[PDB]
Design a protein around this nucleic acid. Structure first.
Lengths: 56, 120, 209, 122, 114
RNA sequence: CGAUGUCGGCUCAUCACAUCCUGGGGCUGAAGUAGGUCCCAAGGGUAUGGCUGUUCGCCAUUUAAAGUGGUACGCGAGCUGGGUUUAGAACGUCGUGAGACAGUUCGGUCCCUAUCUGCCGUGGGCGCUGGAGAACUGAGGGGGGCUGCUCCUAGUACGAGAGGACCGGAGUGGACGCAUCACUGGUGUUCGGGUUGUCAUGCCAAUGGCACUGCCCGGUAGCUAAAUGCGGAAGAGAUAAGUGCUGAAAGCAUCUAAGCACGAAACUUGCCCCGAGAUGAGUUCUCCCUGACCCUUUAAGGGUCCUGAAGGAACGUUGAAGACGACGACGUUGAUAGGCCGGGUGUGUAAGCGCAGCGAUGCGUUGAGCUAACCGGUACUAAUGAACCGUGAGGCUUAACCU
RNA sequence: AAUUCCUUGUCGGGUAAGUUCCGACCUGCACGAAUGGCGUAAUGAUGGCCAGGCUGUCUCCACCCGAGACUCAGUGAAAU
RNA sequence: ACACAGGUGGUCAGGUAGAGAAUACCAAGGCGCUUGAGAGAACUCGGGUGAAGGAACUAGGCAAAAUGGUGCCGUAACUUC
RNA sequence: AGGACCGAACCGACUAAUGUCGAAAAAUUAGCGGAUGACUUGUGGCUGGGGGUGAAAGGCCAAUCAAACCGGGAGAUAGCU
C-alpha cells in the first residue's frame, strides 16, 4: 500500500498543477460609497446597491 | 440522491436541527436582524415566514399554535401585536438575505437575515 | 422514416371498455418546424433538421438566430437532425405536426435517463451482496475479486465496477402507440419512456419488427 | 409468492393438513409460484385415513396466495393464507373431491376446470 | 399540469357514492365468461380508501367461507358497476388494517347513523 | 527459505473446444417417432437443496442442459477460518520414559490510509492553425445473440398395429437485461393522530422537551422492487460440415482442376450506446472582427496608445444535474429558488365554547384543524449595472479562375 | 464409542434426500474393572442433533436517520 | 511517554414512578467532551422499518428477532424425594 | 439455613462487531457468569532466579518468563553471513 520507488520532484510538480487559486476579478465598485465590495456582497461598512442596508 | 427532495440536514440530527430553528426564529423576532451562516439563513426562511403568515390572522387558536412552536410568551406577544399588522399587506416574503463576509475561524460564508420592514 | 421531438409530460393509465387498464406516458409533441435540409449534393447525406418550443428572444443569441434567420423560422430550444429514408421530401419552414404518427402501430422513443450519480456495483450491475453476517468484516457491498492472478497480471477492459450510472441517452424500441391527438398535440404510447417528467424525447417509428 | 420451503395449508379432502413445497416447477431456476402453477410438494401433516400419508412426494396447484394476483384492470385479490390443491404426479388430476374456501378466476384452465367446478366461490 | 388533468377528467365516472373507510359496502362487478358478460357481487367492509383523482381506489375485506378475502378496486374502472353503501360505521382511523388480525369478536365495527 | 504466506466455500470472473443444451448436415442393422454415431460450429446459456470442513462423491427433485479443463489445483494488499500446522486437554495404540502416530476428538489473534501500472467513471490544459456558437458525418470500439411449452397445420406424410412428422404460422412463459413509477406495495426520524412515564410552562386545560423517532398506527413527494412496459429477431453479404450442377485431366465418369448456385445461434452487417485527441484532428449552416504607429537581425516579430466584438467565464437564485469539476434553466424585458394564494393529498371531528352525565367520557359547532418535497398562479423577498477574459481581417508556395 | 483402520460397516427411527444424531447388532484393527468399570436426579457462558416460536441470516436486497468518506479554511503525520 | 474513551480506596447521596444504590425524567450542583463550515456520492461503521416465504444462509440459528412483569390457575418423564 | 435462585454496586471475561500506524502496547459497544462466599477489596509485611509461588499452564514474578533485570568475565566463541 506504499510506494515502490520515490516519485521524482518533476512528477511531484505535475501533481501540483491544478492547485493555484483563482483571482477574484469581480470587485464591483459601489455606486455611492464606492467601496471594493464583491458582487452580491455588502460593503465593509454595510452599503449595498447604494443603500445603508445594514442600518449599522 | 435527493431527487426533488427538500430540506437541509445542516450536519445535525433532526431533533437538534428542529430545536435550533425554534431558538433561531425567536432570536430573530426579538432583534429583527441577526448575523448567521448563509445556508442556515436560507433554511430560516422556511420557518419564520410561516409565523408571520400565522400572525397575519389572529385568534386564540393561532396564539396557542404560535406558542406551540417557538415556546415563548415574549415572542408570541412580539408576534400577533406588532409584526402581524406591520406585515398585513405583504403577500409573503418577509425576510431579506444580505451576504456579509467570511467568518474568519472556520471560513464560513456568513450573511445577514432581517425583516423587510425594520423601520426606525 | 422520420420522427419528431416531444416532451415527456407525466404518465397515467387509460381504461379500455374491456376493463384493460393500459398505462401510458403522455408526450406533448409541439409543431416541429423544419429548420434546415441537408443533401447528398452539398453534404453527402439527405436529412432534415427540426426545432420545437420557443426560447426567450433576449436569451437566444446572435449566431443561432442568424441561423434561424436564413431558414426564416421562429426560434426554438435547440435543433435535432433526422435522416431521411430516401424518397420523402420536406422543405425549409414546413411545420411538421403529430399528424404524421396517425398511421403507425409501434414507435421508438429515444430519451435521456435519470441520473443516479456515482452508483455502486450492486445498483449498477446487480452484483450479489456477500453475506451480511457470519463473520463478514467490513465487506458487504464491495465487488470482491476483480482479476485472476499473475497470468493476466492486469484487469481486463470492461470490468463491471462502480461508476456513473444513468444520465445517459437510451432508447426503448417498439412501444405500441395508443392514441394520437392533434388538437392537444398529445401522443399516448404504451409503457414507460426514459427521462424525468419534462425532459425531451426523440420519437420515431419502429425500425425493428 | 410461493417458493421452496414454503408451508401450504391444504385445501381439499385429500387428507392432509400442512404441506411444504420443495421445488417450483416449470423452467430452470424459476424462483416463484403464482396462482396457476404446478409445484412439487412433500406432506408434513396428514389425517389418519386420507388418500395420502406423511412423507410422500407429489404435485399441487397453489390456489390461494397471500400475495394474491393482479387482474387486468389493476385490482388485486389477496387472500388470508396460502392454499393448494393436490395432484396426481403424472395425470395432474386432483386427488380429493370437496374443495374448501374460494378460488381465483385465473385458475380457469381446461386441466383445472375440474377444480373450478368443485370450488364453492369465484 | 393542466395536460394530464384534462386528459384524466374525461375518464372519471362522475357518480361515485361517497363512502367512508369503515362502512360496509356491497360492490357489484362485471365478469366476462368468454362471450357471456355477467355481473358479480361483493360485500365486505371498506378498510382502505386512497384518493388520487383518476387513480382513486378502495379496498374491501370480506370474510369468505372460512377465511378472509381482501380485494382492491380501481374506482374509475368500467369493471366496477355499483358501489351501494350498506351501513355507516363509526371508526376513528383512516385505514382499518387491524381488521386483518381481529376476527370474530373484535371484528364488530360500530355502526354510526348520526 | 534477509518469507511466492493458506484446503474449500463466498463475491466476481475470462479464455480454450477435445461441444452438456440449442443450430446446421452425413450414414445405419434410422419404417415413423424417438434415439445411436461421426463431422462442422464458441455466440449465448450452462440448478436448488441433504450429509461431509471438503474438492470429490452418493442421494432427493428438477431442467432444453445441470459440459471437460487452463487461469500460482483463478480469485484471502477482496471477506470467511470449518479443515489444516502453534502453546491447553482427553481416548486407543507404540515406547521403560521424555514423546510419537497408516490415527480422531472438543477450543483456539487472518495486519496494510494505494505512489505506479491496470480498470471503471469524471474534469482541467493545449492543440485542431483567424476566433466563436451549434447540428452531424463516420473511422474505430463496446453491448446485445438462451430457450421451454401449447395450438393450427394434423392426428396429415409414414405405419402391421401401437404410435406418429418435417416444414411454416401464432399465442403464452422461465432466466436475464434495459427503462419507468400510472397501478399493486416498501420506506418515508421534515406530515397528522393516539398513548405510558416524567419535568417545565405559577395550577387545571391546552402544548412543548426527553426517554432508540420514547413506544407505535397511518402516510405525500422521491427512491424502489416483489410492480409495470420493452428487447433478443428477421433479412442481407461472404462461408464450415455438407448438397449440388454442368464438366475435363482420365472420349466414360467425376461436387472441381475453369466456372457456377445454395448452405449455421458461427463470420462481416443489420439493432442500441460511445465516438473527429480518427494529430489522416472531417463536413455543413450561422455570427463577429476591415486601428494610428514606432522598431529592428523589413521578423508568420515585438513594443506604444487607441479599440476591445461574436461570445465566454466569473458571481448570484438553482435543478428529477451532481462526490468536486462538469452539465441544464433563469438572472428583473425575470416565474430560477423561497414565501404567499387557491387546489390536491395525507391524517380522522382541532382549540374554545355550549348541553347531558356523580365522573371517566360522549354529542353539537365540525369531514373539522393542520398539512413536508406535489400541481396551477403570483414578482412580496433575493438573482444590481456593468466589469474581467477574448481582438483588430487571418503565413508561405503552387495551380486554376478574373483585372 | 472422545477409542472402529477397513467404512459413510449393517439394520431400524428421524429426512423429499442424513459421512453428523438416537437405538441395536458384535469381527472390540488397538474397551475393561481406583492409570477405576457401568449407570445416574440436579447442575453447566460445555460437545453434537432435532422441533416449535421468531425473525433481513437467506431468496434479493430496498428505503430512511446519524458518524466518516467528498469540497472549503487552519494545523499537519506514517510504514516505504 | 500525551490536555490519552482506561485504572484509583472511604463519606454524603433528594423529588416522581418504581421492590431497588435498576431504570426513565429532573433538584442541588456541574457541564456541551478544545477544530469548524457546508455537501447530503460509491463504500464502511452505529441503528430504524419491511411486502411474501421463514434456517431454505452457514462449518454451526453467529448475529439479530423474539420471550420478558404482577396476581391467580395449572404443571409430565424422571428422581438421591 | 444454604460453597441456594434472580439481579445492581463490586469482581470476572463466554459470543459478536469495531479497532489493528487504534482513544488504548488487550480497550469500547451490545448482550453474558459469580454476586453471604473456596467471595471481593484498602493498608502494611514475609518468601527470590534454577529459586520463589502455583485450585498445576509450566502459568506469574514491575508491558520482559523453558527461566527476570543490572553490571562483570567479555572484544566469549562463531568451519556461518
Amino acid at each position: 500500500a506504499v510506494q515502490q520507488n520515490k516519485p521524482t520532484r518533476s512528477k511531484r510538480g505535475m501533481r501540483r498543477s491544478h492547485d493555484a487559486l483563482t483571482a477574484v476579478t469581480s470587485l464591483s465598485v459601489d455606486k455611492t460609497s464606492g467601496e471594493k465590495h464583491l458582487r452580491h456582497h455588502i460593503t465593509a461598512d454595510g452599503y449595498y446597491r447604494g443603500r445603508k442596508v445594514i442600518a449599522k | 440522491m435527493r431527487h426533488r427532495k427538500s430540506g437541509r440536514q445542516l450536519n445535525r440530527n433532526s431533533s437538534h436541527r428542529q430545536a435550533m430553528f425554534r431558538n433561531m426564529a425567536g432570536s430573530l423576532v426579538r432583534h429583527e436582524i441577526i448575523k448567521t451562516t448563509l445556508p442556515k439563513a436560507k433554511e430560516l426562511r422556511r420557518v419564520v415566514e410561516p409565523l408571520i403568515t400565522l400572525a397575519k390572522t389572529d385568534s386564540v387558536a393561532n396564539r396557542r399554535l404560535a406558542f406551540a412552536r417557538t415556546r415563548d410568551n415574549e415572542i408570541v406577544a412580539k408576534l400577533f401585536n406588532e409584526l402581524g399588522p406591520r406585515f398585513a399587506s405583504r403577500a409573503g416574503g418577509y425576510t431579506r438575505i444580505l451576504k456579509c463576509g467570511f467568518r474568519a475561524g472556520d471560513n464560513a460564508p456568513m450573511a445577514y437575515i432581517e425583516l423587510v420592514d425594520r423601520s426606525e | 422514416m422520420i420522427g419528431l421531438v416531444g416532451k415527456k409530460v407525466g404518465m397515467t393509465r387509460i381504461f379500455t371498455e374491456d376493463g384493460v387498464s393500459i398505462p401510458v406516458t403522455v408526450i406533448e409533441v409541439e409543431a416541429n418546424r423544419v429548420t434546415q435540409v441537408k443533401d447528398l449534393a452539398n453534404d453527402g447525406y439527405r436529412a432534415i433538421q427540426v426545432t420545437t418550443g420557443a426560447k426567450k428572444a433576449n436569451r437566444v443569441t446572435k449566431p443561432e438566430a442568424g441561423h434561424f434567420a436564413k431558414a426564416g423560422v421562429e426560434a426554438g430550444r435547440g435543433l435535432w437532425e433526422f435522416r431521411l429514408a430516401e424518397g420523402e421530401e420536406f422543405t425549409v419552414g414546413q411545420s411538421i405536426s403529430v399528424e404524421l404518427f396517425a398511421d403507425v402501430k409501434k414507435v421508438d422513443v429515444t430519451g435521456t435517463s435519470k441520473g443516479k450519480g456515482f452508483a455502486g456495483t450492486v445498483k449498477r450491475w446487480n452484483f450479489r451482496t456477500q453475506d451480511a453476517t457470519h463473520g463478514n468484516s467490513l465487506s458487504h457491498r464491495v465487488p470482491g475479486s476483480i482479476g485472476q492472478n499473475q497470468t493476466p497480471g492486469k484487469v481486463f477492459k470492461g470490468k463491471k465496477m462502480a461508476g456513473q450510472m444513468g444520465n445517459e441517452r437510451v432508447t426503448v424500441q417498439s412501444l405500441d402507440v395508443v392514441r394520437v391527438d392533434a388538437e392537444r398535440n398529445l401522443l399516448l404510447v404504451k409503457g414507460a419512456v426514459p427521462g424525468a417528467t419534462g425532459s425531451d424525447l426523440i420519437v420515431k417509428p419502429a425500425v425493428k419488427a | 409468492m410461493i417458493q421452496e420451503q414454503t408451508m401450504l395449508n391444504v385445501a381439499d379432502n385429500s387428507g392432509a393438513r400442512r404441506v411444504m413445497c420443495i421445488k417450483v416447477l416449470g423452467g430452470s431456476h424459476r424462483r416463484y409460484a403464482g396462482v396457476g402453477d404446478i409445484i412439487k410438494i412433500t406432506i408434513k401433516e396428514a389425517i389418519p385415513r386420507g388418500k395420502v400419508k406423511k412423507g410422500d412426494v407429489l404435485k399441487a396447484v397453489v390456489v390461494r396466495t397471500k400475495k394474491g394476483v393482479r387482474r387486468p384492470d389493476g385490482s388485486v385479490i389477496r387472500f388470508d393464507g396460502n392454499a393448494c390443491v393436490l395432484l396426481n404426479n403424472n395425470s395432474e388430476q386432483p386427488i380429493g373431491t370437496r374443495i374448501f374456501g374460494p378460488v381465483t378466476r385465473e385458475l380457469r384452465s381446461e386441466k383445472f376446470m375440474k377444480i373450478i367446478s368443485l370450488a364453492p366461490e369465484v | 399540469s393542466n395536460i394530464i388533468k384534462q386528459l384524466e377528467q374525461e375518464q372519471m365516472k362522475q357518480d361515485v357514492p361517497s363512502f367512508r373507510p369503515g362502512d360496509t359496502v356491497e360492490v357489484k362487478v362485471w365478469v366476462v365468461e368468454g362471450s357471456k358478460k355477467r355481473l358479480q357481487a361483493f360485500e365486505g367492509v371498506v378498510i382502505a380508501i386512497r384518493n388520487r383523482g383518476l387513480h382513486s381506489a378502495f379496498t374491501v375485506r370480506k370474510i369468505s367461507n372460512g377465511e378472509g378475502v381482501e380485494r382492491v378496486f380501481q374506482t374509475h374502472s368500467p369493471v366496477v358497476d355499483s358501489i351501494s353503501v350498506k351501513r355507516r360505521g363509526a371508526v376513528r382511523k383512516a385505514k382499518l388494517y387491524y381488521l386483518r388480525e381481529r376476527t370474530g369478536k373484535a371484528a364488530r365495527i360500530k355502526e354510526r347513523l348520526n
